[PDB]
Design an enzyme around this catalytic site. Sequence first.
Site, short mmCIF file in Angstrom:
data_model
loop_
_atom_site.label_atom_id
_atom_site.label_comp_id
_atom_site.label_asym_id
_atom_site.label_seq_id
_atom_site.Cartn_x
_atom_site.Cartn_y
_atom_site.Cartn_z
N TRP A 1 -9.28 6.98 -0.71
CA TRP A 1 -9.41 7.74 -1.95
C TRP A 1 -8.42 7.21 -2.97
O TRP A 1 -7.46 6.51 -2.62
CB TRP A 1 -9.19 9.24 -1.70
CG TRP A 1 -7.93 9.52 -0.97
CD1 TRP A 1 -6.67 9.56 -1.50
CD2 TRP A 1 -7.79 9.77 0.43
NE1 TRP A 1 -5.75 9.84 -0.51
CE2 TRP A 1 -6.42 9.97 0.68
CE3 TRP A 1 -8.69 9.85 1.50
CZ2 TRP A 1 -5.92 10.24 1.96
CZ3 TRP A 1 -8.19 10.13 2.77
CH2 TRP A 1 -6.82 10.31 2.98
N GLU B 1 -4.46 4.33 -10.69
CA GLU B 1 -5.31 3.16 -10.53
C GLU B 1 -6.51 3.18 -11.46
O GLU B 1 -7.06 2.13 -11.79
CB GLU B 1 -5.79 3.04 -9.10
CG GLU B 1 -4.74 2.88 -8.03
CD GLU B 1 -5.44 2.77 -6.65
OE1 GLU B 1 -5.88 1.64 -6.29
OE2 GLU B 1 -5.61 3.82 -5.98
N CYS C 1 0.83 -1.20 0.00
CA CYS C 1 0.00 0.00 0.00
C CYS C 1 0.87 1.26 0.00
O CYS C 1 1.54 1.55 1.00
CB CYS C 1 -0.94 0.01 1.21
SG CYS C 1 -1.95 1.52 1.34
N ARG D 1 -0.07 4.55 2.84
CA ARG D 1 -0.07 4.29 4.29
C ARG D 1 0.32 5.44 5.10
O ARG D 1 0.42 5.22 6.32
CB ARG D 1 0.85 3.12 4.64
CG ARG D 1 0.37 1.82 4.07
CD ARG D 1 1.31 0.75 4.44
NE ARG D 1 2.47 0.68 3.54
CZ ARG D 1 3.56 -0.01 3.84
NH1 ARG D 1 3.60 -0.65 5.00
NH2 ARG D 1 4.60 -0.06 2.99
C1 HEM Z 1 -5.78 6.56 1.73
C2 HEM Z 1 -5.88 6.33 0.41
C3 HEM Z 1 -5.26 5.05 -0.21
C4 HEM Z 1 -4.57 5.00 -1.36
C5 HEM Z 1 -4.21 6.17 -2.30
C6 HEM Z 1 -4.17 3.63 -1.58
C7 HEM Z 1 -3.43 3.16 -2.65
C8 HEM Z 1 -3.10 1.84 -2.84
C9 HEM Z 1 -2.53 1.23 -4.02
C10 HEM Z 1 -2.18 1.97 -5.32
C11 HEM Z 1 -2.37 -0.07 -3.77
C12 HEM Z 1 -1.80 -1.10 -4.77
C13 HEM Z 1 -2.95 -2.00 -5.20
C14 HEM Z 1 -3.29 -1.74 -6.63
O1 HEM Z 1 -2.62 -0.93 -7.31
O2 HEM Z 1 -4.26 -2.38 -7.10
C15 HEM Z 1 -2.83 -0.35 -2.43
C16 HEM Z 1 -2.84 -1.57 -1.78
C17 HEM Z 1 -3.39 -1.88 -0.54
N1 HEM Z 1 -3.89 -1.00 0.41
FE1 HEM Z 1 -3.93 0.99 0.14
N2 HEM Z 1 -4.65 2.87 -0.52
C18 HEM Z 1 -5.35 3.71 0.34
C19 HEM Z 1 -6.00 3.35 1.52
C20 HEM Z 1 -6.00 2.12 2.14
C21 HEM Z 1 -6.79 1.74 3.30
C22 HEM Z 1 -7.78 2.70 3.99
C23 HEM Z 1 -6.47 0.46 3.61
C24 HEM Z 1 -6.98 -0.47 4.73
C25 HEM Z 1 -7.81 -0.04 5.68
C26 HEM Z 1 -5.49 0.01 2.67
C27 HEM Z 1 -4.89 -1.23 2.64
C28 HEM Z 1 -4.31 -1.74 1.50
C29 HEM Z 1 -4.04 -3.13 1.22
C30 HEM Z 1 -4.34 -4.33 2.13
C31 HEM Z 1 -3.48 -3.21 0.01
C32 HEM Z 1 -3.05 -4.50 -0.73
C33 HEM Z 1 -1.86 -5.25 -0.16
C34 HEM Z 1 -1.82 -6.61 -0.84
O3 HEM Z 1 -2.39 -6.77 -1.97
O4 HEM Z 1 -1.23 -7.55 -0.23
N3 HEM Z 1 -5.21 1.05 1.80
N4 HEM Z 1 -3.27 0.84 -1.89
C1 LIG Z 2 -8.66 1.56 0.06
C2 LIG Z 2 -7.98 1.57 -1.28
C3 LIG Z 2 -7.66 2.78 -1.89
C4 LIG Z 2 -7.03 2.79 -3.13
N1 LIG Z 2 -6.74 3.98 -3.73
N2 LIG Z 2 -6.73 1.63 -3.75
C5 LIG Z 2 -7.01 0.44 -3.17
C6 LIG Z 2 -6.65 -0.83 -3.89
O1 LIG Z 2 -6.12 -1.71 -2.92
C7 LIG Z 2 -6.24 -3.07 -3.07
C8 LIG Z 2 -6.32 -3.66 -4.33
C9 LIG Z 2 -6.43 -5.05 -4.42
C10 LIG Z 2 -6.55 -5.72 -5.77
C11 LIG Z 2 -5.26 -6.26 -6.35
N3 LIG Z 2 -5.30 -5.97 -7.79
C12 LIG Z 2 -6.50 -6.57 -8.39
C13 LIG Z 2 -5.62 -7.52 -9.17
C14 LIG Z 2 -4.41 -6.84 -8.57
C15 LIG Z 2 -6.48 -5.82 -3.27
C16 LIG Z 2 -6.40 -5.22 -2.02
F1 LIG Z 2 -6.44 -5.96 -0.90
C17 LIG Z 2 -6.28 -3.84 -1.93
F2 LIG Z 2 -6.20 -3.25 -0.72
C18 LIG Z 2 -7.62 0.38 -1.93
#
Ligand code: HEM
Ligand SMILES: Cc1cc(N)nc(COc2cc(CCN3CCC3)cc(F)c2F)c1
Lengths: 415, 415
Positions: free
Chosen positions: A285, A290, A113, A116
């Site tokens: 947000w 993305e 993430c 964070r």
């Molecule tokens: C505050 C705004 C946030 C932004 C801009 C953000 C952005 C991202 C991005 C770009 C990813 C990579 C996943 C992808 O590209 O599909 C990600 C993953 C993730 N985020 Fe954040 N996120 C946010 C908030 C949060 C929140 C609120 C949580 C949990 C309460 C969280 C937990 C996670 C988790 C668990 C992953 C994936 C880790 C994995 O796949 O093992 N995020 N986030």
């Molecule tokens: C709260 C939040 C804000 C933000 N801006 N983006 C995300 C996306 O996060 C996540 C995305 C995935 C999907 C993995 N991809 C699909 C195939 C690969 C799994 C997760 F567990 C996430 F947490 C979450």
Amino acid sequence: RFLKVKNWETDVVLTDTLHLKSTLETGCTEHICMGSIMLPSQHTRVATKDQLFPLAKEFLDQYYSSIKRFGSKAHMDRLEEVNKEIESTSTYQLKDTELIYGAKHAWRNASRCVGRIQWSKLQVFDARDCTTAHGMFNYICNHVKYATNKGNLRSAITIFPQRTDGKHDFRVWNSQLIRYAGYKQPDGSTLGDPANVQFTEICIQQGWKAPRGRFDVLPLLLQANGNDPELFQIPPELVLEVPIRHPKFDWFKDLGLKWYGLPAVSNMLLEIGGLEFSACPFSGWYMGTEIGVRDYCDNSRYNILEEVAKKMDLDMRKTSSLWKDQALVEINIAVLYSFQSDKVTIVDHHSATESFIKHMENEYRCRGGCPADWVWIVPPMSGSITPVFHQEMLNYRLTPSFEYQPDPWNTHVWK
Amino acid sequence: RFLKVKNWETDVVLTDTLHLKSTLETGCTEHICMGSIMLPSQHTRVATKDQLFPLAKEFLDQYYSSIKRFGSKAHMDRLEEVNKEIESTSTYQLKDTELIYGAKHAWRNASRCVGRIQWSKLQVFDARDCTTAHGMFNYICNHVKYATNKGNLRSAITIFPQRTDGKHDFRVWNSQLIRYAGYKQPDGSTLGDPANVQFTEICIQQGWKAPRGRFDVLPLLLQANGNDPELFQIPPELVLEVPIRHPKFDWFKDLGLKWYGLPAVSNMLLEIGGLEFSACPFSGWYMGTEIGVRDYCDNSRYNILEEVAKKMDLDMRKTSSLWKDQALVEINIAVLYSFQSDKVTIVDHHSATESFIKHMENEYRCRGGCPADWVWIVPPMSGSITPVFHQEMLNYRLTPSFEYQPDPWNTHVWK
Ligand code: HEM
Ligand SMILES: Cc1cc(N)nc(COc2cc(CCN3CCC3)cc(F)c2F)c1
Ligand code: HEM
Ligand SMILES: Cc1cc(N)nc(COc2cc(CCN3CCC3)cc(F)c2F)c1
Ligand SMILES: C[C@H](O)[C@H](O)[C@H]1CNc2nc(N)[nH]c(=O)c2N1
Ligand SMILES: C[C@H](O)[C@H](O)[C@H]1CNc2nc(N)[nH]c(=O)c2N1
Ligand SMILES: [Zn+2]
């Protein structure tokens, strides 16, 4: 050990001792590295009572250590109290405070993430009193409304009751609360979002009246205490959407795209003190990429690079004209523009990655480390012109954590 | 085990058993992954006779196994023959054939190299008869000329004698045969290429007459059999250069940039059958991003995104205008354009990454695997619109290999 990570743009060095407290495994051995396998058998999620106390003990030992009451009587009573309850029921229940701490630290420990820096500013919604799909629909609607805050987006999580036996299990069958539908066509092509086409069919299997178009907000499928899931439509007024225009190209409205404001992952599993929360949707947000990069331009997603290039009138013959690259920057300028012109919270990939470095600093000063997954931290466009490309990151698995879990429609014993 | 890697764009799966033959370690443990540390203590390079035979044995056992003469008499004689010579001299010498095989397979095994589809098409230049810096200068000049082939570039490697004691050691002190100079300014700013400023000063330390400008082709510093290195200027006619224009922007000539045709890494160490070749410069042709993205736009490299945006007249106030992204695609369109309009070999990052996938297929069919480093395979721009973003890659360390080594000016006991 006490390993060192370097930044090669800034010659800054940090020291990581946080990895020592690490517990879980990663998939990598001494002779192989697997930091690019998407879903490893590690990251994916059944547990017994013998296993359960150390996990409660460890969790409670950091939680009291954080409020500056390490190992005292209020601590030892609480260790005794859950120890006893884990004898009695073979499981236990989290104090409202222990739940807020565990949730915020599952996000704080999510190494993939980029956003964070905001982990401590998380609204925890305790839905452990929920019994029905209708109650789930209501907690979720209140989640959407609060998190959306009329575009001024706020981070939230809603935590339905923890898994017990395993066959009485709360699940949101959606992967995100708000996603667009995906239908296949006669020629085999795909309308809407190809990602969800299987899910969209399951919803029609359960009687969804699909308006078979593009940006069709899917209904919710909610499973409560093991029961067969039930369909619910989020009130449209609660589903905020942003129509994508461009600040040059008047023909960009004609493209006719739009996205939803609220990214809200619903299919993950939340682990706290050895307890497993199978329904725990969380939201924040968007970073722009993305939508602009992945959603819109992935080959097996919306795949709009074709039409955007055409309209820009581009040298689309040669590969080396870089027309794909050219139209990807414009698509991402228009996503940002649109979202900010509508007062909907969005972060660009430069701003967010600079913040993650700032965050890494704090995590290394005031915590001794920060697990990070470079493969997933680096933004899917313009990687090396953002500072995280040049930052070495140790990936390791702390807990509390979010974990992947199998989709319920293979597991759920139907009826 | 017999691990599986997936592509998530194409749902193609490959099986990797090649990692079983792997030998070296990676830096990752079961509890930590380090696939984003730049130079790990593993990848960096003193060895004895006891250690030496297994490494010769193993190498000769694959080399005969490749020409379809595994473990036969021609094999066993050769194992006996080097065994004997390793008793006698405590080292040994490679047949001209064993050197060509070892070299080509060090490249084939380089997991950070996106261009490995061409590994078998490598010209090996055997310079193990070299005794002086002047001989080194001559082998190198013949390398440049042959590899350059008047723009129709060809892969080559020139292999100076293997390390023996360790203090008699051939080294090219340049990191690449052809690089531009780097000088610091009064205000502390930097002319030329900031990367090499320390190297440029060492050359002036040894008496280089710097023409203190931008694109100043550095001289060669050549160390022969442990002796103090000596300066040599590649004949300018042998240094092919490409002036960077754009196929729209007439003001892009005015920018006044240019690059050299020949990427030719000279500071690496070549390991074959346990023997160490400290001087082994190797060359191919460029992928565009390596100039347009990294060389030109890295913050601590040429850092031209400033001037290019200015001239494009860009919204440079906000971060979220994406002006950095916009000017990075144009800079990379102009690098490609210029190189191909001058009949100088260059590959775009789409073409090269598609080829690496095709290559991975072959390596997995006809060899059972292919070690790859996603962190380094994915191109530094537009990552996810190239197929390697969506391809899982197992990284593991086979041998023969190229390895990093400390810069000689810290090691070299001077005089
Ligand atoms: C505050 C705004 C946030 C932004 C801009 C953000 C952005 C991202 C991005 C770009 C990813 C990579 C996943 C992808 O590209 O599909 C990600 C993953 C993730 N985020 Fe954040 N996120 C946010 C908030 C949060 C929140 C609120 C949580 C949990 C309460 C969280 C937990 C996670 C988790 C668990 C992953 C994936 C880790 C994995 O796949 O093992 N995020 N986030
Ligand atoms: C709260 C939040 C804000 C933000 N801006 N983006 C995300 C996306 O996060 C996540 C995305 C995935 C999907 C993995 N991809 C699909 C195939 C690969 C799994 C997760 F567990 C996430 F947490 C979450
Ligand atoms: C044929 C044209 C070639 C192209 C387009 C190419 C491209 C690349 C690129 C982009 C990298 C990543 C390094 C960076 O971005 O700075 C790389 C790494 C590398 N390449 Fe290739 N390369 C080519 C030929 C060769 C040859 C001829 C050899 C050896 C004989 C070779 C061996 C290596 C090695 C050792 C690395 C670095 C691995 C490491 O750092 O551990 N490559 N190449
Ligand atoms: C033959 C060839 C063709 C081509 N197109 N590119 C290359 C670059 O390869 C290499 C680059 C580096 C430098 C690492 N970077 C500097 C700081 C990070 C080290 C190596 F050992 C390489 F092999 C080589
Ligand atoms: C194969 C590879 O692991 C996969 O494509 C990953 C790479 N990095 C990623 N990074 C982010 N943020 N999101 C992703 O979906 C992926 N996908
Ligand atoms: C910190 C990180 O390992 C470092 O910036 C790497 C990332 N990936 C790379 N990939 C390539 N091709 N070249 C590089 O120099 C780097 N640098
Ligand atoms: Zn690893």
